[model samples]
Target: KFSAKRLQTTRLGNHLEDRVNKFLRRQNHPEAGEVFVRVVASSDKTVEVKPGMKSRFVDSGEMSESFPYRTKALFAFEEIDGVDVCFFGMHVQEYGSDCPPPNTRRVYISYLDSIHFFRPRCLRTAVYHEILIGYLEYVKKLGYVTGHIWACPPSEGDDYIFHCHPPDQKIPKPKRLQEWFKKMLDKAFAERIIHDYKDIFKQATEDRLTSAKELPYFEGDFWPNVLEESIKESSGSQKLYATMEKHKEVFFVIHLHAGPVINTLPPIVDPDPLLSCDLMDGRDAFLTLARDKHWEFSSLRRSKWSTLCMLVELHTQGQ
Candidate 1:
């Protein structure tokens, strides 16, 4: 029997809407009872639902800029008055050869790309939290292994378009957004929603004012392809590379792994200097020189070596 038959019969869109509605109701907000959630649009892979009305963010061009080039799903919540209260969008993809060994099989990966709320601060926070819970539950049902987010604040122009903050209110800087993201992650961890999280770009130095920039063009269908192109082009030291590297530093890559897989997977091992030496004689010489205090390598080298070792170990385990 083909799995396509089972997938085709499931109403995934309606299921997610219902799950979100249930979570919102549990929040017990004054308007929770009146709020209606729906999946407005989705990519070809997902089952589409009939949307009541498109969110204003999409109309105003904010959604296109905030989300990745090809987001897989979009959710909108509307009040009894027929006014849109919130919009959420995500990009979902299956793990490939590039992923760690444990992340293969029926596992899926989700990226929270766009989220905005048109409400007071208190209501915004509560609704955001509930929406995330709903999404995680929805994806868990579909066999998602992890979630990822790039917690970078938009530029002032784009931020103004999305949030519409008062002129007197100050725009959020990158450092502020980083702290807020950390707080949210801590809350989620304490609630046991995610087993663990790591900031892959943790080594990069923070620059408070710089905003993260997205790729101007879609080089391929997926985000990974776009990332690959960015890196390849940047390797030649193109003009755009400076901004791309800055974006990496400003936008922390937060990876959220589900609790179930943590114990089942082998613990990621630290890079062995001996292994690095064996891989390259030049690296061995450099390590010897560094040990003798004759020469020193940059932190970039350390990070690259660690990443290479991780990939090598994962590949070895796969066999």
Candidate 2:
């Protein structure tokens, strides 16, 4: 025979908040300039998150010209380790003009070619993957269907386009980020992180900027859709963007979100999963070993780090 006892229950207002706070206090907190999660923006403002929680939009906005008709970009600001930093995240509303709308909205994933981060010791390709995970979950509540990534660079005159080729060329050439993203895309496809939907995803193969009398609307939701494709090449191509102009030989990679993927994770390429973002950061620590024994403790790894730091230092002194 077993004895049953009545259990007492209590109503709570901030009890959930209090418990969440404790959980966050124990989680991996952001150090100065550390971006462990992909930041999301919102249309509404909030003050609920704790330091250790998965990152998201602490601020919000609605659909507009800047965000476009079916798409939106979210932004937020936070004092990371105290200094204010702004965060931006975005989503593509549709995949292609022809493809029927899926049950879920797909967010196109790509690296921000123009935005520069305080890339630090903990930087890695996989870092943003988890960020996207938290982001997708947040957007799902707002009725987003799925997260989609098209690793290819822009095809238009916008120099930041990652991949490009001449109008006469059959294959587009990968540029600064396009090259890095290519490697990452291969790893992701291999790991089944994303499925290739090129057959269904479409963009103008012919250059819309051509002198032809009729200019295309430049309206389409897909580019870099195929694993084999690159940014559309054009005659208007100028010098590469200044961000990568001097650092021509350098490259960086990103981490893929490890959570759930919808509609597909196709076995497209690499069989082995590449290092996670945190893993890349760990790998980068070994770079210190590459320094000359006589070099100072904080010697420059790449020339730009020193240059950037020097510029900031000099400007601050002048101020």
Candidate 3:
């Protein structure tokens, strides 16, 4: 539901519009401040657009343990103050020669304020799927974005990145209740998930006609375990491993905002105790922060003092 109310050059109307604008500004989301959106009571104007449904294809067979298919994401948009302020889940797209390197799928959100102008937020979204965009970018100020990644489904919060290790901080023991944050030092770049694949193939055949044997190359989409046979083809070969390590494999540049997050939790929420004894406290730590600052973060950077909800959503596609 969306509506547009023009800010007339009058005191009452201007104040109302400005009120909504201010509410939007303090919403903790950069997009909320930059985007001109107005939530109206109701409207009949509606349009359904799937930004990247073109590449979608049905699976070869369900019996086969593995098959990859592009998910069609939907976003609801509305007009406000005569401007087309659209709302959708998190997304990323890279533009240059137009073809992104096979090393990885780089996803990030963009803010287009004016003509020929774009500002990229300095935050790295900790996700690689299409569903969790809005949840990661969840903003609960004036108008809400409908498709927040974790709105519902998959046993809510089970797969959420923020609550991945609920109770915020937990120790690794039978009594340890909290899991320490995955240190975000550039060190994880060398992890196995960042490695490269053996061979890359285009799903669309070179010749769309007589080449109907295997359809799109099932080999490229399902990599690693899903494509173990494909991976085994060049296994014992050091050259394969060399190909991944020597060059930049799957690399993602997460430029998080150096903004300071102020922590507003109760002293009862001790780190060690929360980690070793109470899991609920660790989880509450996040909701506590979100409630305190009024920010909708699925996950973020946490510390004893300032807190940063690095809840970002990636809206890009890759192999």
Candidate 4:
């Protein structure tokens, strides 16, 4: 007699995996070809993928779940023949439900909970772009209304360590990590993937940690008024208020000790279903734009050919 087995597959998880893989393939880089992406539901039990490979679960227990509508998932980006290179975690939840009438069902997405990269070299490739864009595409398809990213750098004992630096490497300072995340937000805005970006906690003092109670909170219909007033007050608002009002959504960035929160509009979706092209055209357009803008893909470093030779020797010796 044989026992039945249950697979840890969900409709959304499978879709996420496909989207990530599609984006990776579209990158058309040698590095992309050497990696595979997998998405699985979070659970207490670990499952074997390959003979020696086990899936890692990044749980969402720490996230507030008082709200009835919230979903969370994790992604693993692994080398084709080696170990996992990175892990990405994200959650989507409904906002504005705590307010009065005319409160439409709007969703807010966040990926700040986890962003860990084991292989720093992968940063030099399109892995970061693929992970971000792929998730955006998935979110767009699902009609998520907004994005909120907390750009806080990870500390030594944080639940979500930003990256796994090697023993000989130096960990990035808080300000450096904050700048890096700001650059990412800048690029997202430049690419027109998001709109109405606002740092809600920009006024907080740098030397002192601001209490959460001190920060302002806007909910429901009042959010649009805040966006309109911000546009009129700040010359740096980028004139995105028109679209923000039209969509009736706002993205916010906060910079408290928890992190700087950045709000973003939902990604643009094509009107013509036939011409949607499964995000291929969008991916290509992003690549072209990145090239034209001369945007450096990642913050990591790679030395000259001679330095690579040193790495080759170390690898050969099983170090």
Candidate 5:
């Protein structure tokens, strides 16, 4: 349930397309901004473009055959207060030969104009995940093993980065919320029944035949008990423990494949939640700053503020 509108210069039909061009040009990614853009409408509220889906770009407005290794980019838009708001994301590819490590492959973002729009609005967690899942699917095919978010909306009032990587990879510098975010994640992925965990993993790795048999890794009653035990000795409130099981959004367990190791086991299931949490918190702590700004500026639901307050509360309590 997805459609694409090739951008047109006429009325500047592609608001996002135009914005990205300006974004990259200023950022020095001339090779990137000149590549052209497209507007994707995920009728199901989730963008779905299979690896080979046919598409045409705004530049030439001409059809092009799908090919592997092509870029994956997403730009989401919503009109509020009679002005269109937008967010954009792109898949980055690096062979580890590049500097800065190219840690995260998928990048999610919005321009300064829409950035101001969400300053007072609630940004739904579900909306973020919907775009993330689609972007993840594209990068996974491109061999990308990480995701990143730059200049997120502010709830507590700060800009930050939310990076995604394999749970096993060690983060260079850990942030304060890394541990508590793990608890929040446990609530979303292990504590509660939202979407079938297996289905999300299945779709994520569907193209990788070798990893198919490992699907059962997320199953069984072991996780909840593991979660409870981990927090039992914590000084945090018990309800903080209870909030573990929840959320209908897709949860990703990125497992990086590095130098050859024993194939018998999936990457170490360090449910202690250390590595990945720290990796994300560089931007994770900024959620309040970012989300609050959205809640404050936009005409979005009030609960966005409440929901964020609750999550921020959970972070505090879990600490």
Candidate 6:
């Protein structure tokens, strides 16, 4: 056994990784394990990810900070139990006064504002919801106590703060992911996903340019606990489509080492609201429909097939 912290991450990763694959199997998207999970900055102002699993990291339709030398920041993906995990976006550690280092990757979930060439549309929610399922499964198996969510009371520059005490090793095993899945997610989730991120998650209510002032911080083991309530809204068609249009496949990181005692992931919001990251987290998500059960689930299958067929129609509009 490892330290409670390390053990929790291990167990959490294991649980999440398994759920990720389950979603994949259900969706029938791709069968690649070697996804470029994160970007590693070999030098300051430059970054690079392993090239083989080019689906997760590289994006042709978007402006990437990672390149031959540098693109995005580097994160870690370790498989626990029998799971495959892919963690990017929040791996690069950032320190600020009284702030958590690397903090949680909650910021990226709010890409409704970020500019991109194309939208991911049907693809964004598909990938993200899948990953989120993995995370929720892990949380359930590990057990949780709190089911709290924040709605930013309001301030001039900032308004809200969503806080969950870090997972302690003293709790019991939680329920199945499907149980938690039934919860009524707030409209905030809808607002962010549609890209109306004015004051969506904490970003809008908080100060701007946190990258320099002081990055958001949360206390938890295993890359700062994945906030279930922080996911924000994404906007633009290109922003939505770019996630799948660019990457051949998505990724998941099952960090099972988070310990037995974990915090209940209240009805949280996605941080990055764009279609860039591969973080599917729900059964109703498009990815759940297309990637896993597209062939079986008629609704999803027809939607994706028709979507592709329509693209062809647009391509040959005048031809």
Q: Each candidate: what lDDT?
A: 0.37, 0.28, 0.22, 0.36, 0.28, 0.25
- TM-score of candidate 6 relative to the true fold: 0.24
User: Tens digit of lDDT per residue, candidate 3, span 1-319?
Assistant: 1122231122222332343344445546554323322211111111111111111211332122222211211122223233332232221121111112221112222211111111112111111111122212221111111110101112333422122322442223311111111232122223322112111121121222121122222221222222234233433223323432332122112311112311221121101110111111123443354456654322222210111121111111110
Candidate 4, position 83, lDDT: 29
Q: Write the per-residue lDDT of candidate 1 for residues 183-281, one digit (tens) a residue.
A: 666766776765555543332222221211222112122333444455444332233345445555344333345446634654322121111112112
Say what the RMSD of model 6 is.
Answer: 20.5
Candidate 1 residue pairs in clash (backbone atoms < 3 Å):
none
lDDT of 4 at 172: 59
Looking at candidate 5, the ten consecutive residues that score lowest on lDDT are 40-49
Q: RMSD per prediction, one decimal?
A: 22.8, 19.3, 22.5, 17.8, 20.7, 20.5
Q: What tens digits encode model 6's per-residue C-alpha lDDT throughout 3-28?
A: 11121123333444455455445654
Q: What tens-digit string does per-residue lDDT give for candidate 4 at 1-319?
A: 1000111334455555665566556654565433333332222111112111011111322212122333333444444224233334443333333322111223444333333333444553245554554555455444543444444444664333222233344445656655655665566566555553554333223323222212222222233344435434542233333433343222344211122222333333322122122111212332343335443212223111212222232233322
In order of appearance, the predictions have TM-scores of: 0.45, 0.31, 0.22, 0.43, 0.26, 0.24
Which segments of model 6 are wrong by more than 4 Å?
Answer: 1-9, 30-123, 147-319
lDDT of 6 at 48: 29
**Segments in model 5 whose C-alpha atoms lie over 4 Å from true places:** 1-74, 80-83, 87-123, 146-253, 256-319
Candidate 2, 286: how far from true, in Å?
40
Query: Which regions of candidate 4 fall more than 4 Å away from where they truly are?
Result: 1-23, 26-39, 42-66, 80-86, 90-125, 157-165, 168-170, 201-319
Model 2 segments more than 4 A misplaced: 1-70, 76-81, 87-91, 94-105, 109-114, 119-125, 133-148, 152-219, 222-319
- Over 14-78, each residue of candidate 5 has an lDDT whose tens digit, in order, gives 33345433434554322221322332111111112222211212123222221112121233434
